[PDB]
Amino acid sequence: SMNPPPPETSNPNKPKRQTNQLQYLLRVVLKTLWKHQFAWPFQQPVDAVKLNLPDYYKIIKTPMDMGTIKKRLENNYYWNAQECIQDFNTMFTNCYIYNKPGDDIVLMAEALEKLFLQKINELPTEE
Ligand SMILES: O=C1CCCN1c1cccc(NS(=O)(=O)c2cccc(F)c2)c1
């Protein structure tokens, strides 16, 4: 029932870069999803205490949220686009694992994921 430390967003000895694809993931992908009417449950780590989800972090062992992704992008935490793409996919998958079909939160994730997929389809080639 207690909350874990959030995923890290800073790690000085981790290798990191700026790439044009990572710039796109911030300026286009993250910004598109962040402004969406259904973004709010995903804009910070799941607070299992406030939301009364005592089993959440017993089930979800790789938590991820857009708050974390946003900070990672702003802090240039990533080495490549695939790392960031994986974080988004982890976020969506967690939602589908924990919840059941047709739940409001799943409909919300599905809407965000559709947009995500549309934007990642237009990911620029590197350099
Ligand atoms: O699985 C995840 C990923 C992010 C949040 N989340 C989740 C899952 C179950 C319940 C709740 N609690 S809630 O108040 O934020 C809530 C309730 C009903 C609908 C809705 F959209 C939002 C949140």
UniProtKB/Swiss-Prot annotation:
Tissue expression as described in the entry: Ubiquitously expressed.
UniProt-annotated location(s): Nucleus; Chromosome
The record's account of how the chain is modified after translation: Phosphorylation by CK2 disrupt the intramolecular binding between the bromo domain 2 and the NPS region and promotes binding between the NPS and the BID regions, leading to activate the protein and promote binding to acetylated histones. In absence of phosphorylation, BRD4 does not localize to p53/TP53 target gene promoters, phosphorylation promoting recruitment to p53/TP53 target promoters.
Domain Bromo: 17-123
Crosslinked residue numbers (Glycyl lysine isopeptide (Lys-Gly) (interchain with G-Cter in SUMO2)): 58
Residues under site feature: Acetylated histone binding: 99
Family, as annotated: Belongs to the BET family.
Domain characteristics, as noted in the entry: The NET domain mediates interaction with a number of chromatin proteins involved in transcription regulation (NSD3, JMJD6, CHD4, GLTSCR1 and ATAD5).
Note: JQ1, a thieno-triazolo-1,4-diazepine derivative, and I-BET, a benzodiazepine derivative, have been tested on tumors with success. Treatment with GSK1210151A (I-BET151, a I-BET derivative) has strong effets on mixed lineage leukemia and promotes myeloid differentiation and leukemia stem-cell depletion.
The protein's role, per its UniProt record: Chromatin reader protein that recognizes and binds acetylated histones and plays a key role in transmission of epigenetic memory across cell divisions and transcription regulation. Remains associated with acetylated chromatin throughout the entire cell cycle and provides epigenetic memory for postmitotic G1 gene transcription by preserving acetylated chromatin status and maintaining high-order chromatin structure. During interphase, plays a key role in regulating the transcription of signal-inducible genes by associating with the P-TEFb complex and recruiting it to promoters.
Assembly notes: Interacts with p53/TP53; the interaction is direct. Interacts (via CTD region) with CDK9 and CCNT1, acting as an associated component of P-TEFb complex. Interacts with RELA (when acetylated at 'Lys-310'). Interacts (via NET domain) with NSD3, CHD4, BICRA and ATAD5. The interaction with BICRA bridges BRD4 to the GBAF complex. Interacts (via NET domain) with JMJD6 (via JmjC and N-terminal domains); the interaction is stronger in presence of ssRNA and recruits JMJD6 on distal enhancers. Interacts with NSD3. Interacts with NIPBL. (Microbial infection) Interacts with bovine papillomavirus type 1 regulatory protein E2. This interactions may serve for the tethering of viral genomes to host mitotic chromosomes allowing successful partitioning of the viral genome during cell division.
Medical condition linked: Cornelia de Lange syndrome 6: A form of Cornelia de Lange syndrome, a clinically heterogeneous developmental disorder associated with malformations affecting multiple systems. It is characterized by facial dysmorphisms, abnormal hands and feet, growth delay, cognitive retardation, hirsutism, gastroesophageal dysfunction and cardiac, ophthalmologic and genitourinary anomalies. CDLS6 inheritance is autosomal dominant. A chromosomal aberration involving BRD4 is found in a rare, aggressive, and lethal carcinoma arising in midline organs of young people. Translocation t(15;19)(q14;p13) with NUTM1 which produces a BRD4-NUTM1 fusion protein.
Protein name as annotated: Bromodomain-containing protein 4
Species this protein is from: Homo sapiens (Human)
Gene that encodes it: BRD4
Residues of the full protein shown: 44 to 168 of 1362
